[PDB]
Symmetry: C5
């Protein structure tokens, strides 16, 4: 089989469409997601044209091997898609209607800067490489782009599934390549992060601040050091759910900042005891009383500054 010959110099337009059936396994660490969808393809092959009156049929059904089919590939896939051809139908004017159901693991980079209050634009890049006989260009049939109502991505809200209608045409190894961008916009369901990570992390920090209403150095050391250990536990838990980023994430920034609060609390606790031993408790009392206001105030202002910088 060979591609359809150009009636005019015109490049062959392959109309595309992706209909999402299932969305699952968005892996944050791996920056991948699995998809189960319909891929629809449509093009004019004049060699396949027929008269409906003479043939006694209005449609002609072929097997993939019987006719020429464009080699459509995904750019950002781990392995080649697991595809099953559903139907191939030819209209009297030679308009081919191809439909396949596929499943694929898609590589799509994620921006964790606002984690866990982040939104992502997942991409599915459709591509076709031109043949020596003729140039192949991709198009979007908006009527065949969509998603099933039941499509759910665990821990995320699915906003939209649209396609950038104008393809990105470029040269790769002296052949024309036509690339389409299918975009799946999602926003993270941040709810669970509040009672599981944010509030427990705040409680242990506030517990460390009870040392500002205590003169017992031994108890203060126990308060600040023990809660710091609990904070290390949360820092480690958080970084296991996330990949290593060359930037600070919003949660990573808060977690890092809380270490400084534990560090300064230890200094205060040390200074208080040192002055007490040195028989200067009136001075130690001034520092401790100031710390009661300074620590929550600086914590609140530093968080306002961070939320501003990130959102």
């Amino acid at each position: 089989v060979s591609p359809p010959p150009p009636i005019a110099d015109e490049p062959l337009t392959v109309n595309t469409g992706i209909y999402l059936i299932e969305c699952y396994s968005l892996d944050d660490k791996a920056e991948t997601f699995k998809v189960n969808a319909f891929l629809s393809l449509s093009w004019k092959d004049r060699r396949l044209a027929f008269d409906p009156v003479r043939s006694g049929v209005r449609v002609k059904t072929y097997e993939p091997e019987a006719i020429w089919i464009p080699e459509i590939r995904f750019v950002n896939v781990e392995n080649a898609r697991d595809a099953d051809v559903v139907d191939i139908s030819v209209s009297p004017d030679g308009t081919v209607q191809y439909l396949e159901r596929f499943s694929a693991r898609v590589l799509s980079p994620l921006d964790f800067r606002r984690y866990p209050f982040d939104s992502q634009t997942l991409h599915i890049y459709l591509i076709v490489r031109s043949v020596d006989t003729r140039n192949i260009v991709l198009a979007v049939d908006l009527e065949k782009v969509g998603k099933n109502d039941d499509v759910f991505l665990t821990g995320w809200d699915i906003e939209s599934f649209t396609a950038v209608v104008k393809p990105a045409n470029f040269a790769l190894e002296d052949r024309l390549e036509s690339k389409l961008d299918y975009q799946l916009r999602i926003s993270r369901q941040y709810f669970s992060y509040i009672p599981n990570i944010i509030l427990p992390m705040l409680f242990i920090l506030f517990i460390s601040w009870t040392a500002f209403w205590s003169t017992s150095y031994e108890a203060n050391v126990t308060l600040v050091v023990s809660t710091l250990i609990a904070h290390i536990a949360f820092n480690i838990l958080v970084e296991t759910n996330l990949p290593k980023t060359p930037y600070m994430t919003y949660t990573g920034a808060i977690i890092f900042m809380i270490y400084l609060f534990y560090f300064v609390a230890v200094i205060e606790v040390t200074v208080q005891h040192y002055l007490k031993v040195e028989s200067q408790p009136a001075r130690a009392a001034s520092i401790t009383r100031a710390s009661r206001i300074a620590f929550p105030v600086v914590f609140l202002l530093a968080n306002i500054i961070l939320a501003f910088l990130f959102f």
Copy 2:
């Protein structure tokens, strides 16, 4: 091969049946389950009619490639089912009896609100796409829907396996689709959660409350902070067995509430010591004595309120 021709304008009815052989790997985090079952299909293809007198045999056995077979698919599967054809029997009128044994990983959403006292309705959606020559509709042969007596799903009780007899017929990408809903009702075996998570979590909480019968601030700090650390360990253990939900789970609610009890216990322990140092122990004694009754009472009432809200 092409579909059987209609005697009139009627759609082709494909009678279905699923018989569960094995149920395994219900993944809570992934919201998936693996299934090993028989898929039975039955349709009339008069082009396969034969005389038993002439052919000698009463029933004809065919290879899947030799005859037309409906393209039956599962909606909610990760990848296409691993299927092995067991039998294809054609009777003299042309009635085909197809039997295959398959294995598949099914995507079925789970409601964790009442975890670990939750029940689920797992779905297996059977689907067929209509062709150009004629429309294909699915039906349920109740005689061929069931499950093996030995079918066990680790950590769950299997209640029923039934099928919604009326298919969901709808248009998808300019063609008819016939969808059947096979429902597997299961209830969680909550037993192990009691001695492994609930009771150890209660013991450490009750241990923190021994600080209400102690005047030693340094020992009280050790009691409440150490048990809080143990509670953090249990919170982390619990959330590793569960996906991130945009709602509170029953266990998640209890675990979160227990943090407030640790926080208020720290306040009490702090207040008690502060008054003692301030030479007001009669007042500290009133707060500590009240706490001995208040903490278990408020804990019991708050748990009654939570159990009411969730069940």
Copy 3:
């Protein structure tokens, strides 16, 4: 190809045998094990009979596609077995000798009640579905049932590999089914559980009891609370190696019971300090002295009771 015709309605007997080459990956949590074995099949096909004096050949070697072979399946397998046909031999009377080497992941429930002093009976269920022309029944050729001497299952002792010679013949979806039960009896190697889990768990518990020879409340709180944290660590480690059971395991029972011992030790430590503060140390001394005998005695008797209930 069609099945061998009967002299009478008498069913076709397919003699079976399984010879284990490799046993590996017994997954306790998944309740699965991987097997690499020989599957031998034998039946009489008179259509394949030949004369021994005329032919000169004593045995004829056929390719699987050339002759009729019964569709033999495993009931309790995750996916269809990975099989490679080794040899097909036909004797003059038409007796077929089929041999294949296969690998499969088998689902076999495990009873953890006596863990880690448990024994299991792993099952490999062989099954054949009857055809319209005639009924197929399974039989055991005991001479072709066995295991390689080198067969080792990491952390287990392999006792026996036998087959229940009488098949379970039953109707399933209007056809006869013949099921054979191949049983692999194994007993757990409990050795490693003693120095890794049982003895370290006992040492930390005995360390908590040194608080019965101490009047220092602050040190006692540190002793009982710290060792309790170490016990939580072991409880969590143990439950990661085991699936969730709707019953108590022997180890789970001991681990749960030890929590009560930590709880009562905290009560004693609290009561001792309360009486001391209340200027009643002679009474506190009576309780502490009693606890020195009571705690090891009640621990020993409670363990005798548990071992009795479980074994």
Copy 4:
């Protein structure tokens, strides 16, 4: 099909090229990385030569089975590459232009000595075994060696993708082998290691040094031992992200050195208390005051020594 015959006592030159589409899953522990790329092959087959004037065609398209294709393999791959032929084009002189898109998991050793400030040279070794009729040699077509601009490897910076133009020709099992070395140079994005591992590890160490401004032995023991436990947590976290090396890594060296600082801090804390009890506090004061300067100074100098030895 047979290889193209030599015009002269010459080997067949197969011009190669690799164009990276996707780079993902660099596993540090496994020392592997996954690749999705184009593999281009070019060789002269005079048997396929044609006249462009009479044929009217500039290029002829062949199916892989229709013509002879060299058996090109990768040396350092886990399993054989998952390949899909994109295009086969023959010029009038008989020059064949082969293009396939493949995916493979590549084994490439990693040097962790300067971790997490390390750089690596990943290798993709192309190989061809000579046939009995003639010797096959590999060459690099630099015009077909490259990478997509969007190629991202999570947690790494991609520097270059070049090929060693001269193949390594050698005898293997009494035949010639032609090996090409494709090199992917990458440098680790160390950023995240600073707020997640390096700075928290420094904070806990500095917290332990507050014991040099405290005379309370009980509080000092709590300070140095608690922070040591937090350091063990970080040591364990670090070694889970890395494979076991027969050499010291830069991070491993720092982590190991910090143990000595905790050990000497315990000795100081012990010596201070011992002298205090021995009624020699003037001496204990001299050691404690010296430790305030000695510990940060020795820590800074030892780190300068280590950074010098490693970089």
Copy 5:
């Protein structure tokens, strides 16, 4: 196809060879390793003999399906090897030279008694089953047994790759079987275990012994209990890298023995405080002073005894 006929009473000798290309993924817990190697086979088939003069060829190439090839299998493999035929060459006398490149996951038991200072002998068992027409025996062609210089197994040193030249001929399911033993000798790279597990474990133990220079019971309890918790952490870390053995490992023995040292240290700390409270400090001083020498001495001697018993 049928096996080559015997000239005489002689069995068919199949000369074998394995050339290791890649060695990876030695899983200690699973007792498996992955291999990528060349498998060479050689046997005489007189039916394929030819005269070089009238043929014009010194060698003849065949496709695997065209000629009889012995069914060579691996005994200790998880699943059947992933094999690709590289070349099949026939010399004038009919000597067939077969070469395939394969990848397989091999089951090979490991002896952990001297871990992490252990050495292993990995096995690759080649096997062939005899046919009714004639007995097939295996042989080793030492010229075709080897390994690539670049073959590296992460965390191990590869010593040798040799084959036991004499096959193990035996009966299995009424047919003779010829088994060859290919041995890969490896020794563990113990280096990393010293700064990561052995020395940190020794430091925490030595820190617990500072309690022998302290009269503060509260601080002593904190010293011995906290370091014991750190030792539990290391015990758990070690047992996650190892399978459960029915014997003691060298590391397991040290780790277990260190628990006894923590236990006796707690007894000493308890005894010291008890005597102090009882107004007998001169006696407590004698026990504490003795413990300063006894604990390091008994630890050193017990380790010499253990190293002797294990090496």
